[PDB]
Design a protein around this nucleic acid. Structure first.
Ligand SMILES: [K+]
Ligand SMILES: [Mg+2]
Ligand SMILES: [Mg+2]
Ligand SMILES: [Mg+2]
Ligand SMILES: [Mg+2]
Ligand SMILES: [Mg+2]
Ligand SMILES: [Mg+2]
Ligand SMILES: [Mg+2]
Ligand SMILES: [Mg+2]
Ligand SMILES: [Mg+2]
Ligand SMILES: [Mg+2]
Ligand SMILES: [Mg+2]
Lengths: 132, 567, 140, 101, 325, 229, 198, 49
RNA sequence: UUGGCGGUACUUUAUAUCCAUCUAGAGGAGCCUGUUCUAUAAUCGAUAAACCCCGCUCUACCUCACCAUCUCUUGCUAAUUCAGCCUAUAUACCGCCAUCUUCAGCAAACCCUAAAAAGGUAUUAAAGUAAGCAAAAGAAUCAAACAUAAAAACGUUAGGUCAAGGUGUAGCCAAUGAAAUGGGAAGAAAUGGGCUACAUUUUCUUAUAAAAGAACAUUACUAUACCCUUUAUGAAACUAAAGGACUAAGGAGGAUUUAGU
């Protein structure tokens, strides 16, 4: 049996999101890609460097917004710009988000030497695709 | 190509309903938490630079590299002193300069002047910074100036400017006398500080004082020094003290500005307006007409930052428009703001909200409701989040246009801007709606608005045990319920007059009785009598007699009604 | 904006030089992406943009490339059980013709700045110039 | 801290081979020809041997950058098969999908 | 009483609001794309959404959609009783009010025809609607036994004398049978600069592809890739494959073919030409002959192609040896 | 290395070892370590305006700062106290009443039945347990499957009462099934003057004989413990 | 006691159907369900379910939307960009006409990718293509030019192809290919005594 | 540069601007282990002399 | 009342399968490679089906975890009586899988029963019902089909993996940690898989698989061995390739077994 990236069946009480519900073989069929860069296109360079930068950017956002992330972040690279689009729960006060946005953007622009912008969409609570 | 989005907050604010600033406080607080996070990040980068040194950006980006502000030249040489001066460290540079003198090593006059510039400009105090000032007679700047073996025009000039900046007007003027005795020549910047000194000093006689400032100008031509914009701007700013006597002098300066070839900037007009349109002007009967001429002169021109008072102009011009109650002039002023990129000179946070608040208030007062509502959608929320008084002006305008059907909607807009629990606004909304009668459909709509404004009072009362329901809202909310098919709710609200011990008004009491007659419910009619007895209102007895004739009272009701009549 | 509109919007300064302009006979723009629909929207945006500036454009779809590789499914042993992965590259070629150097810079900037994420461009300019003055005349 | 002591030793091998790349190029050029006297070629054969062993670029091993796994690595991403599968199966690699055909 | 969310069901008030947002959505989508709202249609909406939200997901159900609520929302979720609680249909308590209301009408028709008292094939090449289609008309779930009973009742109606009203009724439940005619589509007949007639057709065998250009009048001169056919095809079996189309129709030595085959091997290239010639030769033969060609295999493309190798086994079907236990 | 660090959910999943070969066919307790952490608070004690301290204080725009070593030690000790107090809270619980014994379910109240279809509340009804059986059968799921059969009774103390049996794999589910089933089978029992039966009652139900007697006021309930309930 | 902030109603509600949409999405931005006044849905639907709504939709966020690029915006954008463009000479209306006056073709390639570095090694390569008919070559010269260039010359098209990538930069590789043409042309005309022994 | 990531994130965790669930998990296991008397011995004072 | 297995051996069933049918192999010789054994100062794990060209899409040094010998003791990090640990338990686990398996089941919430340890079907219908998970469908192999891939729930084997990584518990901290140098050998042995040959439907040569000219049993076919040269990579040839001769055995391989529709 395949155990990879599958949220296994419980007894109908586990709320999985749209991303979590779909197994790997639905990638490019029902669900898209969380990161979009040009480094895995044919005859393109720096795949190793883009992939490592993404791994860090995902761990950084989790720690900087602990318990405030409703779903996995979406990374969009255009030219040298990096764009982080995260669904965030409405737990923290509004002004705290303005601090964490200013901090996380400035810190990540001086670490990778690129313009980094943070786009936050606030949800009242995690969106449940199905109960499994 | 693109224009401002009327339904969006400023781009600085994050585009999310949870993160959009409701009020003006959250606007400033959100832009102070953002700056706080930016400063927190720069602290980490500038304190642990080894982690932010790998450069992977081609081309190389200088502004995304760690900054270093501490001197890295250890040897004590004139070169090392120059580094400290470049880094702007004041105390460290003084220590190394004195050490250089202790050894006696030669120091260039140009290098010694760069030290005085730093000390004179910062007034012997370390540059202001954040991390986890009068001129002092005994200071490093004056001491170093004396130790200097060879002096040049720049050295004296630097002292004169630093003194004036740090409020040392009397000493600076004395230093200037030495410069003349040495036969050196000053620069435009030094002449501007000297003029700023004479004005700030209080001279007993204005005629002497003005003749003195003119003497500085006469020495500017003897020394073949040509004035700049700041020179004239400084003179006009000084003239704002003498509003009455500075009018003819002020105009003469502007004519000389054009003849010389200096182009008046927005700051130059900002000073003439203050001098001709005093805020504390008792003589409002016949104001000056100069504001009309200036706007024609500046019509269609584009302006750039060329002084430190350019931002002030627009806020001042709008104020003069509101004082004169001329809405045509306000359009010319706003139209000038829209030409080119003049929008950048509206002002900062304190003055940006005054300009538009003054502007929008003038629109509602003197503009047609149809046009007034177009401006309302454009300016708010995209330009500015208004304070509650702005809405009281809007609701008053709606009342004057006989379009009270829109009052319910204005309430919903007001709630977004943090006026949900505003007592003054809630009293105005209900007051206008219930001031006069309306068709059934309009009354039903107002009744829904009255229910919403009641929920604010109820929820507020739940939080606060020591809560007071103001008397007037109680009357307005009850009347609206009766008039709009919510009479059942109005009977429950009749009891709240006793719970909060508010005296029911005579009009309200009789209104309840009229509705009772149409309903035909004697029980409800007697309920009004009960409340009248509680407050010992004289009309209560007359109302009880009115019920006797309006409805047939059962023998049980007669006994109950008689008891209340006795009470 | 309903009533509040800019009056005299500021426009960038474009100064004509005295240097002659480049002449591009052809300018091939090979965009690459994993998603066909993104290329369709970019193809529509680029063809519409070219037509609006007077540029002559043609479009064709070079054959797609799919690269497949095999990996071992288990962390340890179980050689025969594998997992295969693929990357798909899709192409849209915008063949422009008869462009001056000013028209090719403004157009390429406009469409390069709006290149969606995950899309890579490969511009191939073809300039045409006279013969070198030395070559024009044989000299011994 | 690097993943393990094996990744650290390799990192130093990569930094000392970069230092000695020009040197080992110039000296080794004197040996990879038939135009110079064999006496000189025999002597350059000893200068190259005298350089430190970690300067030799054939002692570098490509290891997973995140787990320091010696074998099973994919050179385009510098990740082991196991780590690459975790990222691919989750949609975290841009354009990588499962191969169905 | 479980964490699984309660059944999500839609009221008439809910769908009514979903149709107002859709109507306001169209006016915005029209304003975005610069089109006129009055004429904006379902076709333009789907095209606009594809431009503004490009998605390359292979399954089209997972792509962005701005459809009318009727399409997306299940239709069988409408209120079946009023405010007072009295159902609207007299068969509400059966649980299949629409299936039994239909079986009520068809049984009443049958009784009148039987009480009141020609060829029954008024319609030909038609089929009874499948259960999936019937369920759509009724808008309710049916079982397989329920479908069988309905058809038997409809058949009984046809057996009996049927007035024009009955024929229209049974027509509603008769769906035109697909008429897929496996008949070769003849190519046009072009004319050359010389004025000779010729037809062209493509052929594909394995990885080989051919483009033949048969001429109506010729002496049998076949040129493959600008070469003769005896030279290009030194193997006898490859030449026989080119002979099969003409020999079958006794048309040897009557046409001149010019072929261009690229790809594949010697045998796959001859087969690709054979199909290309047979399809081009269709324009110069009678329709009865074209059917004779189709029934001898000359006009069917061969779908047999090399199968992929599988990971963990030696070949497409060959397995690694089962190690001796 | 920073890249070999996993999330809390995966760390506890492995450590707890709940899903395992031993667990299913035959103690570690989970803890949340982000419970008391306030965003913006670190061991170094820095103060971040807009994150962990007021952005404006007495009208003054604050700047970055750090707490002194003494001040930080207090904050660390205070959090240690709060954590220790939270552990005490976990130990504490509100004792509910036992039934006929201390380790048995018979006689234990489980509250009123759940609301009905149209908001029919049953707050006036009380539920009591009478028997709880844990019976095991033989199904392929576990080889020997698990089953809980619960007999409950309900009544409003005003003449209306009923009983039902609920069966499930989990005890909590058997309680809900029995409790809501019994509300659909309410007998009405006639009481003489509201305190006793109208006459002596003697009966045999299968092999169980019951013999009830009408008694005067103040006599009390002298009956089998299940009959008293 | 603690107060949880209330989110405002989405600003789509305040958007008119005759708004200036280009102003709403000036530049490429992520999909914001509160700014896009469309009832768009995305997601494979569960059985007896509809596709998920725009609010809280990760799939719509993962899409590279073209809301910033709309037919109304593009036309307003290109209208401003017309002042930048210059007019192609009308006389060069055909490909053959271009070869007549401008026989030399220089190929240069640019590359656009996503990352911190703008560097691509392939951008230095340059390719010069000239037709020998355009060059003034005597019968002797043309034969010598064709032997020296070797396989660079194509008899079918009569085009000489010089590809230069040896130099680091593109301006150097371009200047080198032009140099190669001058030496090949001038050398071809020169006649050496050893040539008489062919 | 694994040293830059590990050091930088460790510094941020001590400034309160980053949260490491893994480290807090390990920090409490050491606290519990030390209470049980299984803590790390001091250098030079190991079981073997 | 159930669950089980007993001899369920009985009737239908499998479909490249149990036997039969068919084709090419394995089993013999030579080598290549894994394992066991012997054996070495000198890894570890896998090791019936479901190990044995397995982790390795890869070991001359490095890799390396092994052995011998010499050396270091706050010993990668911002801080830490700390760093580090391929140290024991896969019978504490996460993670990723094998297996039955493209098997068909897993079934929550309600409702009913003269009490229920359980059961709940009849279609010309008799208490069952309205929802999930898997299957189907859908999508991929760029028309269409078919086929192939992918998919395949819950359990079964405490199956495999603490040595991808992380981690519970226990163990080592002048040593079970870190580094340097040199070694990590072999077979009168067994066995698994692969490769080549044994030839005439062949060998060599030119073309090209068309055709032709030669060779054709003692070395004719026939050595990817040993040995001898040159060459490529490398600092290092102990590696690989290309020639040179030397050439031995092998003459189509017992019971038996593998794959293919
Ligand atoms: K496991
Ligand atoms: Mg290597
Ligand atoms: Mg085969
Ligand atoms: Mg007890
Ligand atoms: Mg084991
Ligand atoms: Mg070794
Ligand atoms: Mg070694
Ligand atoms: Mg060890
Ligand atoms: Mg299909
Ligand atoms: Mg399927
Ligand atoms: Mg050791
Ligand atoms: Mg060599």
């Amino acid at each position: 049996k395949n155990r990879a990236a599958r949220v296994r069946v419980a007894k109908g009480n586990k709320p999985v999101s749209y991303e979590e519900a779909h197994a790997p073989h639905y990638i490019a069929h029902r669900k898209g890609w969380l990161s979009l860069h040009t480094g895995n296109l044919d005859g393109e360079d720096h795949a190793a460097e883009r992939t490592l930068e993404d791994v860090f950017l995902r761990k950084f956002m989790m720690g900087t917004f602990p318990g405030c992330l409703a779903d996995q972040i979406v990374l969009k690279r255009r030219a040298n710009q990096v764009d982080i689009c995260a669904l965030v729960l409405r737990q923290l006060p509004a002004h705290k988000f303005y601090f964490l946005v200013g901090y996380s953007e400035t810190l990540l622009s001086h670490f990778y030497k690129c313009p980094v912008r943070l786009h936050l969409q606030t949800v009242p609570s995690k969106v449940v695709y199905k109960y499994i | 190509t693109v224009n401002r989005d009327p339904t969006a907050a400023p781009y600085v604010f994050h585009d999310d309903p949870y993160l959009i600033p409701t009020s003006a406080l959250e606007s400033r607080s959100f832009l102070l938490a953002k700056k706080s996070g930016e400063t927190a990040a720069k602290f980490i980068i500038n304190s642990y630079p080894k982690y932010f040194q790998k450069d992977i950006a081609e081309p190389h980006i200088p502004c995304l590299m760690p900054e270093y502000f501490e001197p890295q030249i250890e040897d004590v040489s004139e070169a090392a002193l120059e580094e400290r001066i470049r880094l702007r460290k004041v105390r460290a540079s003084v220590d190394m300069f004195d050490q250089l003198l202790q050894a006696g090593t030669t120091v260039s006059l140009e290098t010694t002047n760069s030290l005085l510039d730093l000390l004179c400009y910062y007034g012997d105090q370390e540059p202001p910074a954040d991390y986890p000032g009068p001129w002092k007679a005994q200071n490093n700047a004056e001491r170093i100036f004396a130790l200097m073996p060879e002096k040049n025009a720049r050295s004296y000039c630097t002292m004169i400017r630093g003194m004036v900046k740090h409020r040392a007007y009397a000493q600076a003027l004395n230093v200037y006398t030495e410069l003349l005795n040495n036969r050196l020549s000053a620069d435009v910047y030094t002449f501007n500080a000297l003029i700023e000194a004479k004005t700030f000093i209080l001279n007993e006689k204005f005629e002497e004082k003005w003749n003195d400032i003119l003497d500085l100008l006469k020495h500017m031509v003897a020394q073949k020094v040509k004035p700049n914009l700041q020179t004239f701007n400084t003179i006009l700013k000084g003239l704002r003290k003498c509003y009455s006597l500075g009018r003819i002098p002020a105009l003469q300066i502007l004519r000389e500005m054009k003849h010389i070839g200096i182009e008046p900037s927005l700051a130059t007009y900002h000073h003439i307006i203050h001098l001709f349109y005093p805020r504390d002007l008792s003589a409002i009967k016949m104001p000056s007409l100069i504001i009309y001429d200036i706007m024609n002169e500046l019509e269609g021109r584009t302006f750039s930052p060329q002084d430190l008072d350019d931002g002030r102009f627009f806020q001042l011009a709008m104020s003069v428009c509101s004082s004169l109650r001329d809405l045509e002039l306000a359009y010319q002023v706003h139209r000038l703001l829209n030409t080119g990129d003049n929008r950048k000179l509206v002002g900062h946070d304190p003055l940006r909200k005054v300009y538009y608040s003054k502007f929008f208030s003038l629109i509602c007062s003197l503009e047609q409701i149809d046009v007034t509502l177009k401006w309302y959608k454009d300016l708010i929320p995209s330009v500015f989040l208004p304070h509650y008084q702005i809405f009281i002006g809007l609701l008053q305008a709606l009342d004057v246009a006989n379009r009270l059907e829109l009052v319910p909607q204005i309430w919903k807009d007001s709630k977004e801007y943090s006026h949900t629990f505003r007592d003054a606004l809630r009293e105005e909304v209900l007051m206008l709606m219930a001031r006069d009668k309306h068709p059934p459909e309009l009354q039903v709509a107002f009744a829904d608005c009255a229910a919403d404004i009641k929920s604010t009072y109820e929820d507020q009362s739940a939080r606060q045990p020591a809560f007071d329901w103001p008397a007037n809202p109680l009357q307005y909310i009850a009347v609206l319920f009766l008039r709009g098919g919510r009479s059942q709710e109005a009977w429950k609200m009749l009891e709240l007059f006793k719970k909060h011990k508010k005296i029911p008004r005579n009009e309200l009491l009789e209104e309840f009785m009229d509705t009772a007659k149409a309903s035909g419910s004697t029980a409800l009619a007697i309920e009004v009598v009960k409340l009248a007895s509680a407050f010992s209102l004289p009309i209560g007895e007359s109302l009880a007699q009115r019920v006797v004739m309006d409805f047939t009272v059962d023998p049980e009701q007669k006994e109950a009604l008689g008891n209340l009549t006795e009470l | 904006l309903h009533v509040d509109v800019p009056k005299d919007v500021t426009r960038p300064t474009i100064t004509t030089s005295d240097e002659p302009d480049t002449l591009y006979k052809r300018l091939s723009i090979l965009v690459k992406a994993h998603d066909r629909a993104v290329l369709d929207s970019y193809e529509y945006f680029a063809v519409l943009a070219a037509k609006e500036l007077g540029i002559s454009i043609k479009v064709h779809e070079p054959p797609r490339k799919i690269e497949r590789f095999t990996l071992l499914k288990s962390v340890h042993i179980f050689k025969k059980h594998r997992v295969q992965y693929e990357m798909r590259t899709l192409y849209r070629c915008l063949e422009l013709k008869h462009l001056t150097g000013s028209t090719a810079s403004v157009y390429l900037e406009y469409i390069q700045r709006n290149l969606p994420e995950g899309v890579a461009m490969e511009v191939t300019k073809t300039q045409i110039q006279q013969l070198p003055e030395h070559i024009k005349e044989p000299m011994w | 801290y690097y993943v393990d002591w094996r990744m650290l030793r390799d990192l130093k091998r990569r930094k000392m081979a970069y230092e000695y790349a020009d040197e080992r190029l110039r000296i080794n050029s004197l040996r990879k020809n038939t135009i110079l006297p064999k006496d000189l070629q025999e002597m350059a054969g000893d200068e190259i041997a005298a350089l430190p062993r970690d300067s030799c670029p054939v002692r570098i091993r490509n290891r997973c950058v995140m787990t320091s796994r010696p074998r099973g690595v994919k050179r385009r991403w510098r990740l082991s098969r196991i780590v690459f599968r975790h990222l691919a199966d989750h949609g975290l690699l841009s354009g990588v999908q499962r191969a169905i055909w | 009483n479980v964490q699984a969310s309660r059944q999500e069901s839609y009221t008439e008030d809910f769908i009514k609001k979903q149709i107002e947002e859709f109507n306001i959505g169209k006016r915005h989508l029209a304003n975005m794309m610069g089109e006129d709202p009055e004429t904006f249609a379902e076709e333009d909406i789907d095209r606009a959404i594809a431009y503004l939200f490009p998605s390359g997901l292979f399954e089209k159900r997972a792509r962005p959609m701005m459809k009318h609520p009727e399409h997306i929302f299940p239709k069988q979720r409408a209120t079946q009783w009023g405010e007072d609680g009295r159902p609207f249909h007299f068969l509400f308590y059966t649980g299949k009010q629409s299936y039994y209301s239909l079986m009520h009408d068809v049984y009443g028709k049958v009784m009148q025809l039987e009480k009141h008292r020609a060829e029954s094939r008024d319609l030909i090449g038609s089929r009874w609607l499948i259960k999936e289609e019937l369920e759509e008309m009724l808008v309710e779930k049916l079982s397989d036994e329920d479908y069988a009973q309905f058809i038997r009742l409809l058949e009984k109606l046809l057996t009996l004398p049927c007035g024009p009203a009955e024929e229209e009724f049974v027509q509603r439940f008769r769906r035109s049978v697909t008429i897929q005619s496996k008949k070769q589509l003849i190519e046009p007949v072009q004319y050359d600069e010389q004025g000779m007639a010729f037809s062209t057709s493509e052929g594909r065998r394995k990885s080989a592809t051919a483009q033949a250009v048969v001429y109506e009048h010729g002496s049998g001169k076949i040129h493959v890739n600008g070469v003769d056919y005896l030279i290009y095809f030194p193997i006898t079996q490859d030449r026989e494959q080119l002979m099969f189309p003409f020999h079958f129709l006794d048309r040897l030595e009557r046409h001149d073919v010019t072929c261009t085959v690229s790809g594949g091997g010697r045998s796959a290239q001859a087969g690709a030409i054979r199909l290309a010639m047979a399809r081009a030769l269709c324009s110069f033969v009678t329709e009865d002959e074209v059917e004779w060609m189709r029934q001898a295999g000359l006009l069917t493309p061969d779908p047999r192609i090399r199968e992929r190798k599988k990971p963990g086994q030696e070949g497409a079907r060959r397995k690694f040896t089962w190690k001796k236990r | 290395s920073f890249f070999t660090k996993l999330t809390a959910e995966e760390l506890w999943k492995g450590a707890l070892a709940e899903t395992g070969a031993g667990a299913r066919k035959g103690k570690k307790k989970r803890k949340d370590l982000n419970r008391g952490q306030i965003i913006g608070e670190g061991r170094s004690g820095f103060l971040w305006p807009g994150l962990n301290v007021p952005l404006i204080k007495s009208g003054v725009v604050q700047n970055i700062g750090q707490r002194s070593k003494e001040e930080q030690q207090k904050v660390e000790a205070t959090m240690v106290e709060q954590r220790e107090e939270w552990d005490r809270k976990r130990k504490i619980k509100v004792k509910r009443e036992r039934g006929w014994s201390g380790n048995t379910w018979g006689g234990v109240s489980i509250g009123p039945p759940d609301p009905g279809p149209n908001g029919e509340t049953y707050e006036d009804f009380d539920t009591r347990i009478l028997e709880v059986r844990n019976v095991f059968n033989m199904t392929a799921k576990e080889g020997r499957k698990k089953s809980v059969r619960v007999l409950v009774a309900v009544g409003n103390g005003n003449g209306a009462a009923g009983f039902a049996i609920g069966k499930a794999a989990d005890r909590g589910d058997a309680f809900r099934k029995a409790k809501n089933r019994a509300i659909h089978y309410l007998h009405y029992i006639e009481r003489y003057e509201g305190h006793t039966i109208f006459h002596d009652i003697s009966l045999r139900f299968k092999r169980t004989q019951i013999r009830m007697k009408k008694q005067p006021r103040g006599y009390g309930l002298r009956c089998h413990r299940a009959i008293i309930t | 006691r603690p107060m949880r902030r209330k989110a405002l109603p989405p600003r789509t509600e305040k958007m008119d159907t005759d708004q200036d949409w280009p102003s709403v999405y000036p530049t490429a931005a992520p999909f914001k369900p509160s700014a896009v006044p469309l009832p768009v849905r995305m997601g494979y639907p569960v059985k007896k379910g509809v596709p998920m709504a725009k609010e809280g939709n990760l799939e719509l966020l993962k899409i590279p939307n073209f809301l910033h690029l709309t037919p109304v915006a593009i036309k307003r954008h290109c209208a401003a960009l017309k002042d930048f463009c210059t007019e192609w000479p009308a006389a060069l209306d055909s490909d053959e006409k271009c070869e007549e006056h401008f026989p030399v073709e220089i190929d240069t390639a640019d590359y656009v990718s996503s990352g911190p570095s703008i560097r691509n090694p392939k951008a230095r390569a340059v390719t010069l293509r000239v037709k020998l008919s355009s060059l003034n070559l005597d019968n002797h010269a043309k034969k010598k030019l064709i032997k020296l260039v070797g396989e660079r010359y194509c008899k079918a098209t009569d085009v000489l192809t010089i590809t230069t990538d040896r130099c680091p930069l593109k301006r150097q590789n371009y200047d080198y290919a032009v140099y190669l043409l001058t030496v090949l042309y001038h050398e071809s005309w020169k006649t050496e005594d050893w040539e008489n022994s062919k | 540069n694994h040293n830059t990531y590990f050091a930088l994130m460790g510094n941020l965790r001590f400034l309160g601007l980053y949260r490491d669930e893994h480290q807090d998990f390990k920090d409490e296991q050491r606290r519990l282990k030390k209470l049980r008397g299984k803590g790390k011995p001091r250098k030079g004072e190991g079981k073997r002399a």
